[PDB]
Design a protein around this ligand. Structure first.
Ligand SMILES: [Cl-]
Length: 182
């Protein structure tokens, strides 16, 4: 799994400069989300359950991993494997997080960034979500953000957590990528 591997094409929404963050709409197909859930399901171990796929371990996931390299412009040598969660030498510093929603969550369950410069307000945001910048889980969407400033210093605005789900069932996959080859 090196370099960059027909490209992905969807909608990009800029969310913030602190942390620098983008929403990628329909980054995963519905078919890809359902695959990842079912492939992960029998591996899930204990809140949330989870499992880990090594970079390049799975053929369908590997296609997606290439897509992440392409959109981030960072070669696959720098990437970790894939963490899947269900809610109920090393490459140097981590620089970018990609969080992919495998299911749509009707109410609550937002990713929240409480130290972001923005807070969400009003209709359709849970009370937890209103503590910072938040993103609704929609199947196929991906939240991309940088944990370092351009000069390589820490961006504390990139701290994130999961709001409790009030209506629905939240599955997510998280890809971390480093400044250098692992
Ligand atoms: Cl989350």
């Amino acid at each position: 799994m090196v370099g960059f591997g027909e490209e992905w094409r969807g909608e990009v929404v800029h969310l913030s400069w602190s942390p620098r963050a983008f929403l990628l709409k329909n980054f995963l197909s519905d078919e890809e989300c359902d695959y990842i859930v079912e492939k992960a399901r029998p591996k899930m171990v204990k809140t949330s359950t989870g499992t880990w796929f090594a970079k390049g371990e799975d053929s369908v996931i590997s296609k997606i991993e290439k897509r992440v390299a392409q959109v981030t412009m960072i070669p696959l040598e720098n990437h970790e494997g894939l963490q899947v969660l269900h809610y109920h030498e090393h490459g140097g510093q981590r620089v970018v997080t990609m969080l992919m929603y495998l299911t749509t969550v009707e109410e609550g369950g937002e990713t929240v960034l409480p130290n972001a410069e923005q807070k969400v307000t009003g209709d359709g945001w849970s009370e937890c979500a209103k503590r910072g910048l938040a993103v609704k889980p929609i199947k196929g969407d991906a939240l991309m953000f940088y944990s370092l400033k351009p000069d390589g210093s820490n961006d504390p605005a990139s701290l994130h957590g999961s709001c409790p789900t009030l209506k629905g069932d939240k599955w997510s996959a998280t890809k971390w990528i480093h400044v250098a080859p692992i």
